[PDB]
A paper describes a structure:
Here, we show that the NatR–NatT TA system, which is part of the core genome of the human pathogen [name], generates drug-tolerant persisters by specifically depleting nicotinamide dinucleotides. We show that NatT is an NAD phosphorylase, which leads to the depletion of both NAD and NADP in a subpopulation of cells. NatT function is tightly controlled by NatR, which is both an anti-toxin and an auxiliary factor required for toxin stability. NatT belongs to a subgroup of RES domain proteins that have adopted a Flap region mediating its interaction with the anti-toxin NatR.
Numbering used by the authors:
A (entry chain F), C (entry chain C): 2 to 251
B (entry chain D), D (entry chain A): -5 to 122
E (entry chain B): 7 to 122
F (entry chain E): 7 to 119
The structure:
């Protein structure tokens, strides 16, 4: 990575701390309950499916099920922003809830725009959950502030990950354990956080688990709490659209 | 106490792993709208062995079982990503996809295409 | 109340503290989303339904939506254990989660046995949520330990509420703010807790909000987490059946 | 922010309370499997006024709309208690009940019976 | 002319209106009506089979439960109706403005006499 | 006989069976066969359009990425297979016993080059 070399890479490595928040799927166990006749049979079926999943990294095993899940699944075939298909997956999250909803809303449209013809319903009612967790690392980088922010636009590019992916490999070999960075999809310029190692978590209990109702159509992505009254938080497609196309590394 | 122990003892079931897997993949085949030969091309057997699953089960540790679990995982990801709307889950499988370079149900006919479809769905999950 | 007079309850009023746990429905907003076309229209519809509900007690409005909901709804027509339909409703919960599941499982059977003909599906797959909260009162009674324990069996009657309802009125007039009592449904003889006033809560938010999948048949009521891998916790009808009938105050 | 607005100032469409109520009860009437005379017997209209609900919207401020709010709450409680299983929600309304001392839909035909059916469902909720 | 159900229910609810200090508007919020038909109720009657009839009867039952609990003292019946209660989360007439509260107020008064 | 597609692939898999030090049991778990069908390959062939043949083509593709990665030295080609990795959440051969793992190890090796 030529930014890690230019941008004072190893001498900016700092001890960093903060809290995270991310959105997850919450209808996984409900799905397998439709294929089977009892809760006892469903718990056994979920364990058969666990044996075929990719193996969980050794240092992520003692974690909570929601905190260690992002470490065992590989990203998309074009890789995540700071990690590729062949590298160990990173734990991606946001600093504030509005940032995580914008990141999650963008990937609702990625699934939508992937199909050549749109979903026939024109309206997908999904259910999700949000949780918060604390993290602290001994070796941390903030891509938002010092020399990296002069390469901020290249890191926050809408449709290629190459410069951030090479920076992610250089940071990983340099021993960086977690790093903050500015979100490319959040309209309010929010900052995200990524963890290379499961040792960053300070608790191993996901805090403030919150259910959410989501509505995805061809025009917007909306969120509202499933347990309490509330106004919907809307995220239209034009927050992510370039021209009339949804951007992504092809 | 012994009240809940004896009540759970008279009530408990110990289900078979091969019978649970055989039941789950046949239920996933009908909910996804797959024909018996479409299912046959994903798990690597013929229709004659599919009819044996209801009486003898589906061996979990056989290679046929591993492919069947990946198919159930594909249904599992589709149900969650589409909110249980069955007509949208079948639509994703039957519609050409820009990101997967082909129709997902057709790609799942081969080993690498089934893994590629599942890894894509498993990656969209965890992002939202 | 003969129990309040015989046990001289005013002599035994003392400060009390502890934690609570209870199960609630989690598919309320999901239901109204089916009658409606957008999330915006659903949030407005839930607001229209709020205007027809019974009024929130004045001291309960600043609470969280999940903490103040049991204070505005009246109990069954035969009343709760320590409160009748014409009195302000109490906040019922359990000390341990397994006791709350046994109390929740019994009332799954109450709805089931209410219909002359059983539900045609023979299997109801419901989704619920459990939360924990801290409580502390200056005036509290423990119905399970000192002279009230000599009336424990009458309080834990499985189909008669008159004696505990008389005790609930006497405790309320005597200024009792919260009280613990032996659960009549939990097979482990756990003890529940009831709050007369919303001022008992010590926290702002319901904590450890946990989703649960429930399976109700004619033979058992089962629970298992909806977000993490788990084995079901079974609650057979034999935990509550007397002869072959479900007991309740007719 | 700049474009934080340009589609939040985009997707802020405001619905009318009378039109949402008229749409909600007609969807609840059909999901609960009620005939329109059965609906008319609960809220206190005739078949013609129901046809008008889609040109003007059921007035939430009126007493007719208040009975519709209770009826929607009955569906709301039935959906949560029966896990959204439509055949069980309809069976509850059409089957004689030991606790309510009658068939719930017949009781809902009167004002006090509709309240008793709603209060019974609202009390089972909160307990589970 | 001849006795009928609509005229009997109308005469019954207006004798509860007066005796309770109920404005034409306050009554309107309980039975779901505009002053419109209030005047017509003494020349035409109130339809018993309608929902306004179900709420009008529920209000008469509230008036009779008040007459038995206070011994007919109008100064005691109107005092309870407008003084905020604690067993009821609000004042009784404000509760009677909604359908669930109107039933809740009647069942509350039947509970106090339910032991006397 | 005369050349066919079945006799070349079965043939390539057994040429990958050693050079990698793979036992009859370990190979059977990657292509999903019983050890009886393994030795029948040498005079009956391995059906290419089979589901087993698809897994077999992925296995010989793995042994190559190995062959081009380590030049051709078996001392390091077999060492990578049985020594636990950390880029991979386990040792590569145990991953190849799974269907998703075998594809994952192949895509990992093709990325090294």
């Amino acid at each position: 990575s030529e930014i890690w070399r230019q941008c004072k890479g190893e001498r900016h490595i700092r001890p960093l701390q903060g809290r995270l928040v991310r959105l997850v799927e919450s209808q996984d166990q409900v799905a397998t309950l439709q294929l089977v006749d009892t809760l006892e049979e469903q718990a056994l079926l979920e364990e058969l499916l666990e044996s075929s999943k990719p193996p969980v990294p050794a240092d992520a095993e003692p974690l909570h099920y929601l905190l260690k899940t992002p470490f065992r699944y590989p990203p998309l075939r074009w890789g995540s922003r700071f990690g590729r298909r062949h590298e160990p997956s990173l734990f991606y999250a946001a600093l504030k809830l509005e940032t995580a909803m914008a990141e999650s809303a963008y990937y609702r449209c990625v699934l939508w725009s992937g199909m050549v013809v749109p979903p026939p319903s024109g309206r997908i009612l999904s259910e999700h959950a949000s949780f918060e967790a604390g993290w602290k690392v001994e070796r941390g980088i903030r891509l938002q502030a010092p020399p990296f922010s002069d390469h901020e636009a290249a890191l926050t590019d809408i449709a290629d990950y190459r410069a951030p992916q090479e920076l992610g490999s250089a940071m990983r070999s340099a021993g960086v354990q977690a790093f903050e960075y500015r979100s490319a999809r959040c309209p309010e310029r929010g900052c995200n956080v990524a963890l290379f190692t499961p040792a960053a978590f300070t608790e191993k209990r996901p805090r403030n688990l919150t259910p959410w109702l989501c509505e995805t159509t061809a025009g917007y992505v909306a969120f509202k709490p499933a347990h309490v009254p509330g106004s919907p938080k809307i995220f239209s497609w034009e927050l992510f659209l370039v021209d009339g196309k949804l951007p992504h590394p092809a | 106490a012994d009240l809940n122990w004896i009540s759970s003892a008279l009530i408990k079931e110990r289900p078979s792993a091969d019978a649970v897997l055989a039941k789950a993949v046949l239920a996933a085949r009908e909910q996804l709208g797959l024909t018996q030969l479409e299912l046959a091309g994903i798990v690597g057997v013929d229709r004659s062995a599919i009819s044996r699953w209801k009486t003898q089960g589906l061996r979990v540790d056989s290679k046929t079982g591993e492919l069947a679990l990946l198919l159930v995982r594909v249904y599992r990801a589709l149900y969650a990503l589409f909110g249980g709307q069955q007509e949208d889950m079948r639509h994703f499988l039957r519609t050409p996809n820009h990101h997967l370079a082909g129709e997902p149900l057709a790609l799942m006919g081969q080993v690498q295409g089934l893994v590629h479809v599942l890894e894509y769905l498993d990656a969209i999950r965890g992002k939202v």
